[PDB]
Amino acid sequence: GETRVPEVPSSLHVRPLVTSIVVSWTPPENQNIVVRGYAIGYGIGSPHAQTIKVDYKQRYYTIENLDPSSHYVITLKAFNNVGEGIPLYESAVTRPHTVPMMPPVGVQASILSHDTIRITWADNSLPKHQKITDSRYYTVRWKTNIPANTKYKNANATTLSYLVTGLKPNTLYEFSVMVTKGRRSSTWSMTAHGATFELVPTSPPKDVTVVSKEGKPRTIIVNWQPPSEANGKITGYIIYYSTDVNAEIHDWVIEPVVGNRLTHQIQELTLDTPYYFKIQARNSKGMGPMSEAVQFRTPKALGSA
């Protein structure tokens, strides 16, 4: 039906720029009246200055070659062969040509437990001892010193004090803080070292091998590798041995070993007897878990078969 003039469009939106203005719209609600195109009337103060006509398929237009920091009134008319419809009016001021922080100081690491460390820092920018009046947020990163090129774990903090969660014991950590406000951003602060507190081991010692001594069959050599989850400095190891594997933990013969050693010798044992062995690690905090039983039969005597 081209007997009537097109109706007013359903919506009109304007986004301003330095020398441009982005006009975005939606077609009129009543699809009954045929629309041939759209007319965009723009100008400083009044929308009469210039007129741009676009096709019916178009839903956006960028008005180019405009003066910066100027208030523009834009109109959108839907038009066909009988005329131009009721306009949607919208105005926008063009943005100016001009397009655009010190890192925290006195970063100190305060260790509380094996998994949590408190980080404190002061600002020279703020006049008072502590001031949270501006919309500024801090970003703290952490990584292990032992492995090369460790992936940084970032966490955003609101206050000057932050507690780090999910950390491994007996590992050195480095920390860096940075203040961020708006578009501008500052670099990382001076790295502060913080070693986690020692903890009771959670893993038993690995690679447990029992081999009898060359020449002396009554003596046996037990070899083992240190456990993965040591959680602290190694102070020693305890070896348990018994002829019956089903026997209670305290019925097994206690053998004390020093922290430096990873191999121990067990003397005065019965020949042609199957022995079972269980080892556990220890630190300054507690006693680690016992390893799985390792069966090893002692050699047969010269007598009989």
Binding site: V5, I44, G45, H71, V73, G83, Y89
Partner: protein
């Protein structure tokens, strides 16, 4: 989504959609042809030769009528509809157009599209009150001083920013048809760059009514001749479209203008503001003084803190400055037997009930002090003990202590 509040619900500045306040409005005109039907002439230049085509203006026939309805109807370029004045109403006589809006609008532009040639002298006025008093807006003339007693192309200074300027820019007789006179309010004004914080210009753009008066007609010179019959029928004022563009004045406290109970247009006030233009704070929301909303900060009104004990509150500037420009509200007539600036304590002669909170109605219990037994009316706020006379004991002071006998004298009870 609501424009007056953010994603979290925090208030933000909201402005009503830019509209043509003139569109579809009744415009009162001083003169219109066709009453009785009269001939009018359209001059079309053929170089030096001035060809003329005459037609008839007849109000009684819609095909030949030019009503003031054509000023604000759908402006179609194919089928132009324009109001037309009576022929030759030359100076001192002036055709006047008056647009009335029952609401304050921050007008950005006023534009007139013409069917006949643009006038020699034209004037735009505004009304601050609802049509009672008029204030000049903009003047147009080839002789600015001799017509409107204003200098031609006056320089706009920081002092007089509300000055009505006179110009010769859109006065030209040619084009004889389709000529446009568009007035931009904030154009040339020095504070325009920072309008949001300029109350001088916030006031200048504000108007309830708009009046356009065409003082002088453009003529070829045949007007003062013996055979002036055909010549005078060629001169008239004709406006195809009248636009008054701007926004409903809501001081950034309302996203839309809604029709009121008295059928007049008012702001759909948000940010705890009230009044037609959101110019004031909603009753009981007088904690801080009212302020117009800006793009940087939305200045919402804050409700008085009365611990749910007062419906009415007042303000005190001295106290506001004492809080460090944070709060200056004082509660009025605290209910549920409470007293104070915020009704934060019990009335003189009422004790604080430690069980129930301060917000509750039963927060204050009556001392119930005996008029004979007790000495004072006000009791202890914590324990509930009333100051009894010599030899008198009890919370209400109604008992005589062990060893004391009740006497007839009012001064000494026990």
């Amino acid at each position: 989504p609501d424009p007056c509040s953010d994603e979290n619900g925090h208030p933000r500045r909201c402005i009503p959609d830019f509209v043509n306040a003139a569109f579809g409005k009744d415009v009162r005109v001083s003169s219109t042809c066709g009453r009785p039907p009269a001939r009018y002439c359209v001059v079309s230049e053929r170089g030096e030769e001035r060809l003329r085509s005459c037609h008839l203006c007849n109000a009684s026939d819609p095909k030949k009528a030019h009503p003031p309805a054509f000023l604000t109807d759908l402006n179609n370029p194919h089928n132009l509809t324009c109001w037309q004045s009576e022929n030759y109403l030359q100076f001192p006589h002036n055709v006047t157009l008056t647009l009335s809006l029952g609401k304050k609008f921050e007008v950005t532009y006023v534009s007139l599209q013409f069917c006949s040639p643009r006038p020699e002298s034209m004037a735009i006025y505004k009304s601050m009150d609802y049509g009672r008093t008029w204030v000049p807006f903009q003047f147009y003339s080839t002789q600015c001083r001799k017509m409107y007693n204003r200098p031609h192309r006056a320089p706009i200074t920081k002092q007089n920013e509300q000055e009505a300027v006179c110009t010769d820019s859109h006065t030209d007789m040619r084009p004889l048809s389709g000529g446009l006179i568009a007035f931009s309010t904030l154009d040339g004004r020095p504070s325009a760059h920072d309008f949001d914080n300029s109350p001088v210009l916030q006031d200048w753009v504000t108007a309830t009514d708009i009046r356009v008066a065409f003082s002088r007609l453009h003529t070829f010179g045949d007007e003062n001749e013996d055979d002036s019959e055909l010549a005078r029928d060629s001169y008239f004022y004709a406006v195809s479209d009248l636009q008054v563009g701007g926004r409903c004045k809501c001081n950034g406290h309302a996203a839309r203008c809604v029709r009121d109970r008295d059928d007049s247009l008012v702001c759909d006030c948000r940010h705890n503001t009230a009044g037609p233009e959101c110019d004031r704070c909603k009753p009981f929301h007088y904690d801080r003084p009212w302020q117009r909303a800006t793009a940087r900060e939305a200045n919402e009104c804050v409700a008085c803190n009365c611990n749910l004990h007062a419906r009415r509150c007042r303000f005190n500037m001295e106290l506001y400055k004492l809080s460090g420009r944070k709060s200056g509200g004082v509660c009025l007539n605290c209910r549920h037997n409470t007293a104070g600036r915020h009704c934060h304590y019990c009335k003189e002669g009422y004790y604080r009930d430690m069980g129930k909170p301060i917000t509750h109605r039963k927060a204050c219990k009556a001392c119930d002090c005996h008029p004979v037994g007790a000495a004072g009316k006000t009791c202890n706020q914590t324990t509930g003990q009333c100051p009894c006379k010599d030899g008198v004991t009890g919370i209400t002071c109604n008992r005589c202590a062990k060893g004391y006998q009740q006497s007839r004298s009012p001064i000494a009870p026990c």
